[PDB]
Amino acid sequence: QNLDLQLYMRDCELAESWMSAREAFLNADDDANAGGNVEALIKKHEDFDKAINGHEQKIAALQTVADQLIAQNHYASNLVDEKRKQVLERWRHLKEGLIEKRSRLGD
Amino acid sequence: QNLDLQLYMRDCELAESWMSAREAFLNADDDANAGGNVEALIKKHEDFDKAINGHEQKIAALQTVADQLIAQNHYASNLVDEKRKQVLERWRHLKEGLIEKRSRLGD
């Protein structure tokens, strides 16, 4: 629900959608494709390399954002849990007094 | 983390403050021996049990909140991770096709 997480989800959805457009392109291509001319078999080749590259880059940036959001979540959970443990341990020492003093009332 | 986290830490702090006061009274009490007769010893003992139960109760409730916070963070991380997995798989499928249509146009 955090807006940051929301931006990331949006960004992931947008990346998927661009991928989907490319899947459709590959299909149309397969219905006709390029042409056995050297200059342009090569030009098409470079075009695929460019596509693949851009895709890979976009993927790596998203992974970077995912890593950040998860690291923030982990940090929050750790703080929460650790505070809990400190609180529980302080109770363990209170409790010890209570009970003992309760003994001392006379033994 | 944010708001929820802040309130919980404050709650824990307030709880710890309450336990510091108690443990303080205990210090006074630590000595605070004035003999005692049945009815009053008995009412002192009871008074202990009651504080012991109150404390235990606060703790339990703090625990519940900690668990909820942690569950919320786990959920969000899972959403994040899962989307990431998704993008990557969608990418793997597209890459497979780009490499295929490239190669014809290559060798």
UniProtKB/Swiss-Prot annotation, chains A, B:
Q: Where can this protein be found? A: Cytoplasm, Cytoskeleton; Golgi apparatus; Cell projection, Cilium, Flagellum
Tissue distribution of the protein: A substantial pool of maternal protein in the egg undergoes dynamic changes in distribution early in embryogenesis. In gastrulated embryo, the highest level of protein is found in the respiratory tract cells and the lowest in parts of the forming gut.
Q: List the disulfide bonds.
A: none
- Role noted for this protein: Spectrin is the major constituent of the cytoskeletal network underlying the erythrocyte plasma membrane. It associates with band 4.1 and actin to form the cytoskeletal superstructure of the erythrocyte plasma membrane. Essential for larval survival and development. Stabilizes cell to cell interactions that are critical for the maintenance of cell shape and subcellular organization within embryonic tissues.
Subunit organization: Native spectrin molecule is a tetramer composed of two antiparallel heterodimers joined head to head so that each end of the native molecule includes the C-terminus of the alpha subunit and the N-terminus of the beta subunit. Interacts with calmodulin in a calcium-dependent manner, interacts with F-actin and also interacts with Lva. Interacts with Ten-m.
Can you tell me which family this protein belongs to? Belongs to the spectrin family.
The protein in question is named Spectrin alpha chain
Q: What is the lineage of its organism?
A: Eukaryota, Metazoa, Ecdysozoa, Arthropoda, Hexapoda
